[PDB]
Amino acid sequence: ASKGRKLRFHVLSKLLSFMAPIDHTTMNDDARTELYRSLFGQ
């Protein structure tokens, strides 16, 4: 855990609200689910 070798989940104040979620995906959620099941040989 020395020098931040181990991951820690304490709140980071300076990075809080650093960005706002913006989403631009055309494919609909039902279409997304069907595609991932169909990915590759699956």
Binding site: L7, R8, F9
Partner: peptide, 11 residues
Amino acid sequence: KAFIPPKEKPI
């Protein structure tokens, strides 16, 4: 607890 990973639920 500092190493416990939080869990999320699919909405």
